[model samples]
Target: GSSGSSGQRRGAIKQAKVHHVKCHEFTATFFPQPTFCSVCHEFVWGLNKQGYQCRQCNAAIHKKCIDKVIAKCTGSA
Candidate 1:
């Protein structure tokens, strides 16, 4: 057996503009303790430079974690 049915769809909500994390303005620093990366959530490890910290918001992250940052910047305030 076969039957036909009517179909309808709703439009998707428009995406708002995002103020992505600004890592370019970050500064390299050494961590006294093993600081967890904000992006990867893993412990930051290094000799001289451990990781980068946002000058505005103080968000610490690994050097290689820059590319995967999709979160909005809290420093926009």
Candidate 2:
């Protein structure tokens, strides 16, 4: 059972506030606490979120790799 009134779950990305910043022709904003490099598995000074490439691209990668892993392993698993 649940109440008609509900609240958003915690730890949302707040996507509305997310702004894309370009760092270079090949790179972009390196903020957002990049924790790893999906390619070399080495850490980054930061991640360029504004790479403007699809997450599946060879260049675009995330620190934690959770998002990609999730999108890859199962549609919603």
Candidate 3:
């Protein structure tokens, strides 16, 4: 049985808008290697991991790490 006019199925949460921002020189991009994650100050390594990096300074970091910086970020991550 089915109705031509359907309604909401219980409750569902959807993602909001997104803004491509510049964190220092690093932006959201792909890093093929286990590059260093400046935010964690450690090498990033994983399969299909998303992160950020700065081509100018060769700096890189995990996307999650960007927000946790207590100090002013230089896009170094």
Candidate 4:
């Protein structure tokens, strides 16, 4: 006599969610003195449009590095 066991497979359930943070409102601006990027910590050079500046927190960052900004806005405080 012989016996056999049954096996079962389970499907995975996927859940996706996206959450956007309320951060500083930045704008393109020029700087007179030597300034560093708040994100990359690199020098913001050039006479024209040096970098982006937060209208509220006054954070300065490079245009290319603006998307990487993580600092929360202190405007509400």
Candidate 5:
């Protein structure tokens, strides 16, 4: 059901609690609906770019965008 690789799939689930570098309060998780990627301010149309939403806030970001913007997430939880 996902076009992304299994590695990416595990990534989306395994790192659900990872925080955004710019915002420590924000945590990363997935959203099934369309949302905005706050980093690049791009619209995530869905079913393509496997985007992650914040657990604490409503912010959204593309997983690759996250990787591209920074190295590995600063925390595992």
Candidate 6:
């Protein structure tokens, strides 16, 4: 089922571990549920502006947020 979660979807962790800078993967999850996108003021998944999603607030945030925040630090635009 193309459901939602922290995107734990097997091998997901291994996928993250690809980045040597990561050192190791955490929690083993992604693609969490959908919450309110302050930027859009609505709920959504991988189907929103900037292709953004909410990974917090009981949902998922844009993968870019991950790169900017969760990926350990800021990333070049």
Candidate 6 local accuracy as lDDT? Answer: 0.37
Model 3, 1-77: lDDT tens digits are 76686666765666543333343555567766677666688878877877765545545777787665444434333
**Model 6 TM-score relative to the real fold:** 0.23
The candidate, 1 or 3, that scores higher on lDDT is 1
lDDT of 4 at 64: 80
Per-candidate clash tally? 0, 2, 1, 0, 0, 10
TM-score of 5: 0.43
Where does candidate 1 stray beyond 4 Å? 1-24
Quote the lDDT for 7 in model 6. Answer: 62
Task: Write candidate 6's Cα lDDT for 1-77 as tens digits.
Answer: 58776764555353433222232222323345555543334454554334332222222334344444333323333
Q: Write the per-residue lDDT of candidate 5 for residues 1-77, one digit (tens) a residue.
A: 65765554334454334654554334445566667677787778866456665444445677766554442334444
**Any runs in candidate 5 off by more than 4 Å, and if so which?**
1-30, 67-77
Runs in model 4 lying further than 4 Å from the true structure:
1-22
Give the range of the ten consecutive residues with the poorest summed lDDT in model 2.
Answer: 18-27
TM-score of each: 0.58, 0.25, 0.49, 0.61, 0.43, 0.23
| Local lDDT at 31 for model 1 | 82
Clashing pairs in 4: none
Stretches of model 6 off by over 4 angstroms after superposition: 1-32, 37-44, 47-59, 70-77
Task: Please tell me which predicted candidate would have the highest lDDT against the true structure.
Answer: 4
Task: Report the C-alpha displacement of residue 51, candidate 6, in angstroms.
Answer: 9.8
Model 1 scores worst on lDDT over the 10 consecutive residues at 16-25
Check candidate 5 and list the clashing pairs.
none
* Residue 22 miss distance in model 2 (angstroms): 20
| 10 residues in a row with least lDDT, candidate 4 | 16-25
TM-score of 4: 0.61
